[PDB]
Design a protein around this ligand. Structure first.
Ligand SMILES: Nc1ncnc2c1ncn2[C@@H]1O[C@H](COP(=O)(O)OP(=O)(O)O)[C@@H](O)[C@H]1O
Ligand SMILES: Nc1ncnc2c1ncn2[C@@H]1O[C@H](COP(=O)(O)OP(=O)(O)O)[C@@H](O)[C@H]1O
Lengths: 307, 307
């Protein structure tokens, strides 16, 4: 039976790397991975390099596509130095490694000879402020579709892909657990934009951001494995993030392995798991490429969307 | 504020026709329109011709796109005489003229110099048989998402776009109001496939048909105007379709204008309107091109998706 997909194991996937060059040191790579992520240069070669290639083969191809509409409408032509921004989306559960994958990807893509302006934006900054969240009674739904100002989010990406000179996005603080007053991230007509978020790939009664993606990634892994990464990281943060007195979570630093595990699991059980099951996972089918990571965080399976 | 859309009035739209040739007589056009549709050669020139152009500009462009993935995967190349089928979807309410628009489009596209194999398939044949509908208690939800064997529908389109030599689809009888036993529509690797249906443009927790469209159309019009076309056509069918003794609706032929109007409205109120409002209209935002028709069935506004 025919399928819209094609799957590989790392062995099959790596052979598609070809000549793509590795332009990242093992040290640069470090400042790119988040706590708990195992990414090393090898994985960047057998997995991220082919991927970088695929994306580059499509950037050109995807443009012939907008050219047509421009030609059809009988408009000016190029401005080879201001084409239509290539939008890439990275989706996946909390603690699955999206940020690592997105930062690495941005590092690889920016380090290509064109030296493209590759901007990265997370939907974090599009959550509603805690005050506003409390108003709607959503302080325990942070991450669910309704906890984001999607109108703003959509306005943003649309602006960037429609060729605006610059666009602004609010900024979220993981330290204070809230939106930073007056903080803004300005994006100036990038060549490529990477939007990272749990709910980037979702669809709805209104034109959404997933409808503006030219390529998409879904970082996947077993649910019990992700809970594990989540709990584990929670305990680990007792001495890194939580250790800071300014942290909205400083009280967890004192917890014992045992209590921390109990706490980490309750949050996972009442917030992140339900959201992953009800909102995130149902979007996985639409991702151009799904990266299957096993229990050790290693990506060794991939599902590509050819149709 | 930037938008993913661009709108035109017929005046602006017609100028994009250019040189596109009219290869249809006023007589050929006739056997293409359904009862009540006002389409004439003029509209085919000021509206359908530009559209035919746009589509042709994209067929080429859309292919450079699959080429890339083929090149990336390091596969054989062309077979210029078996490229990836261009899938087009035509959505819209019951009685809005989809079938006319789809048949005309197919006529125009087939009559292009390449003389492409342009097949047209309606989702009608993918409804569940009345017996099966009765089992699920859906005899009054015919047209709603759940009244279709979408797995089959998806299997079909996927097969055709994945390059199969041929694919089969069941056949629906408007006369007997049910699926025709043993009837099948065989589609052989067309160059272009047009899928016509109320719910073609919808999205869901699973990869769907709308996800395989390379271009899409949404025939629109005011809701009170469509009800009008529906009721009006119901009465008109008393002497055409319903007049046949074999019709599952032959009993309506006898109705008086007044009773028929009462009946037509109850069906519209309890079936077609709810479905249009709850399922069809919410998909309009995702259509590549929306054709706004006014009360006289004339299309004089269009909304194009550039993003
Ligand atoms: N409470 C926290 N305090 C500080 N940093 C955090 C906190 N929670 C998560 N982070 C970091 O911010 C990012 C959050 O990632 P998550 O939201 O867990 O998605 P993912 O792990 O897939 O990137 C990661 O870099 C994570 O290490
Ligand atoms: N009860 C019926 N009997 C015979 N033909 C019908 C009947 N209802 C609709 N048709 C015809 O079949 C097609 C049904 O179209 P509809 O399902 O009303 O969508 P649309 O009008 O947008 O094409 C049209 O050609 C219509 O004229």
């Amino acid at each position: 039976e025919p399928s819209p997909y094609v799957e590989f194991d790392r062995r099959q996937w790596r052979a598609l790397r070809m000549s793509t060059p590795l332009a990242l040191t093992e040290e640069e790579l470090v400042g790119l991975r988040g706590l708990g992520e195992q990414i090393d240069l090898l994985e960047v070669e057998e997995v991220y390099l082919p991927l970088a290639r695929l994306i580059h083969l499509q950037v050109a191809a995807r443009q012939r596509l907008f050219a047509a509409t421009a030609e059809f409408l009988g408009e000016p032509q190029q401005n080879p130095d201001r084409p239509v921004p290539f939008i890439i989306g990275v989706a996946g559960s909390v603690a699955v490694g999206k940020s690592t994958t997105a930062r690495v990807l941005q590092a690889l893509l920016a380090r290509w000879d064109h030296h493209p302006r590759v901007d990265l934006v997370t939907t974090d900054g599009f959550l509603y402020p805690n005050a506003e969240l409390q108003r709607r009674n959503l302080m325990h739904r942070k991450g669910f579709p309704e906890s984001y100002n999607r109108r703003a989010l959509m306005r943003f990406v649309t602006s960037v892909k429609s060729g605006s000179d610059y666009a602004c996005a609010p900024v979220y603080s993981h330290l204070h657990y809230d939106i930073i007053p007056g903080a803004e991230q300005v994006v100036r007509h990038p060549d490529i934009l990477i939007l990272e978020g749990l709910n980037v790939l979702q669809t709805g009664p209104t034109l959404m951001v997933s409808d503006l993606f030219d390529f998409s990634l879904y970082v996947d892994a077993r649910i019990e494995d992700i809970e594990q990464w989540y709990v584990s990281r929670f305990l680990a943060m007792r001495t890194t993030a939580f250790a800071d007195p300014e942290s909205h979570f400083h009280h967890y630093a004192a917890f014992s392995d045992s209590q921390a595990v109990v706490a980490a699991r309750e949050i996972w059980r009442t917030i992140n798991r339900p959201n992953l099951v009800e909102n995130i996972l149902p979007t996985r089918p639409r991702a151009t490429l799904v990266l299957r990571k096993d229990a050790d965080h290693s990506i060794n399976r991939l599902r590509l969307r050819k149709l």
